[PDB]
Design an enzyme around this catalytic site. Structure first.
Site, PDB file in Angstrom:
ATOM      1  CD  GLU A  35      -2.787   0.935   2.685  1.00  0.00           C
ATOM      2  OE1 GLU A  35      -3.741   0.267   2.633  1.00  0.00           O
ATOM      3  OE2 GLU A  35      -1.781   0.698   3.670  1.00  0.00           O
ATOM      4  NE  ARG A 110      -6.727  -1.366   4.504  1.00  0.00           N
ATOM      5  CZ  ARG A 110      -5.848  -0.947   5.498  1.00  0.00           C
ATOM      6  NH1 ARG A 110      -5.043  -0.043   4.947  1.00  0.00           N
ATOM      7  NH2 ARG A 110      -6.149  -1.293   7.047  1.00  0.00           N
TER       8      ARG A 110
END
Ligand SMILES: Nc1ncnc2c1ncn2[C@@H]1O[C@H](COP(=O)(O)OP(=O)(O)O)[C@@H](O)[C@H]1O
Ligand SMILES: Nc1ncnc2c1ncn2[C@@H]1O[C@H](COP(=O)(O)OP(=O)(O)O)[C@@H](O)[C@H]1O
Ligand SMILES: Nc1ccn([C@@H]2C[C@@H](O)[C@H](CO)O2)c(=O)n1
Ligand SMILES: Nc1ccn([C@@H]2C[C@@H](O)[C@H](CO)O2)c(=O)n1
Lengths: 242, 219
Positions: A35, A110
């Site tokens: 991320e 994510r």
């Protein structure tokens, strides 16, 4: 379309980074898109090709900090850039990793879906984004996805489930400065969204395929060594069904 | 194959009026308007145009991101949807968005350094993906006093409080980009795009339209 795309999801400090970065070592066919948290703590855009030869790339603003200090002012700004930065990282790694691999898997830390349906949505529900900001945001996200969506579609989701209390503890262990004031109550709201989306599966998105995407739920509350063997076994078994 | 020509100029110089006239000269000619309606009624209704003018230090970044997003969307849509010599005219471009309007906001301290850095990164990335490269620009040149009068004529509620000084600033950036050619972008090809400058300070034209017809034939 050859590369299997798997998103790792879970609350702040659940242990996604730790797990997947150790997990990916098991196979040369396995890579991870982290991320872009560092891009949020130090905001920078590209330098001119001559200017970079004589001027350093300086540390910029910390929009992460700005969002936590004044969510009602900075939420929209932050979520927009969080999603932009992610799509950029994910699309480049899809285009450039695992060219030859027998059974290539790209794990995403994510996804654009958690950006919208967990994080931004929670900000809207908390009145940190007003109606106009929330409308602009979903309009943008919708549009980005109709463009850069097919390529980014997930083959599965691995949900690392940790209690809010575990997450709060782990925020303190990790010591990221901008997160040190996060209250239990905030993590709890995030917990409930992930549960609705990934576990109960009652959260409806604008992306119909996600009602069907396979999900593997893993309990990560125990110390890392205590469950790692079984977790790995479960991931391997899950990947072989996709 | 479609030729893409941006019409540039200050607020209320007459770009919508001019391109709407121009369009009728050929069936091969289409326009993409600035999606101003979508800005004054934010739909998936709030008025983000009004919010930007009333509270620029709060809403400038949000407005500019949406302005540019709505523009790119509309331009890509028109491109995708049997003409001999097709021409698409854009009312303004992604470049004026960034280098005239967003830049002016940053210079006025209506956006901070962080907001401007985010905006620029977003714009850099958004346009690296995107087809929209221009074959020419038409600069409708009007004085800020002409533009202020035309704001009043048109009567868009959101615009009625704009001072002459704000339009002067926008005017200087236009002249720097399009007349003096001293404004530098990180978009190399733009230094070579031809520019037709048209003075539109007088009351409306026939001639100006003819001048375009022919500019296009050199492209
Ligand atoms: N199972 C675990 N047992 C003990 N500490 C863990 C465990 N998983 C992660 N940690 C620690 O928790 C903190 C957060 O982990 P991290 O992977 O950075 O979480 P995420 O990527 O989900 O935010 C780190 O300090 C890491 O050392
Ligand atoms: N040359 C002109 N002479 C007199 N009125 C003009 C002229 N050009 C435009 N107008 C009027 O000025 C106002 C602004 O024109 P418009 O085309 O909406 O500007 P823009 O698209 O550049 O914002 C309108 O009310 C329009 O009818
Ligand atoms: N769209 C997102 C993604 C992540 N976060 C937060 C910000 C950080 O504190 C962590 C980073 O994983 O999560 C967030 O607030 N919004
Ligand atoms: N990127 C943009 C484009 C246009 N504008 C202004 C807003 C309205 O008053 C008019 C519409 O042409 O221009 C603006 O402020 N920013």
């Amino acid at each position: 379309t050859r590369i299997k795309k798997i998103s790792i999801e879970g609350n702040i400090a659940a242990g996604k980074s730790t797990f997947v970065n150790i997990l990916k070592q098991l196979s040369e066919d396995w890579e991870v898109v982290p991320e872009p948290v560092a891009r949020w703590s130090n905001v920078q855009s590209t330098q001119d090709e001559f200017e970079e030869l004589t001027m350093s790339q300086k540390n910029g603003g910390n929009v992460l900090q700005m969002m936590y200090e004044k969510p009602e002012r900075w939420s929209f700004t932050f979520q927009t850039y969080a999603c932009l930065s992610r799509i950029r990282a994910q699309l480049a790694s899809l285009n450039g990793k695992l060219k030859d691999a027998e059974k290539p898997v790209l794990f995403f830390e994510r996804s654009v879906y958690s950006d919208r349906y967990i994080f931004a949505s929670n900000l809207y529900e908390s009145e940190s984004m007003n109606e106009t900001e929330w409308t602009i945001y979903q309009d943008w996200h919708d549009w980005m996805n109709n463009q850069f969506g097919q390529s980014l579609e997930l083959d599965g989701i691995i949900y690392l489930q940790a209690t809010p209390e575990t997450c709060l503890h782990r925020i303190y262990l990790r010591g990221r400065n901008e997160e040190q004031g996060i209250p239990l109550e905030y993590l709890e709201k995030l917990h409930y969204k992930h549960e609705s989306w990934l576990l109960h599966r009652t959260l409806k998105t604008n992306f119909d395929y996600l009602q069907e995407v396979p999900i593997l739920t893993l309990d990560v509350n125990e110390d890392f060594k205590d469950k790692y063997e079984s977790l790995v076994e479960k991931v391997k078994e899950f990947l072989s069904t996709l």
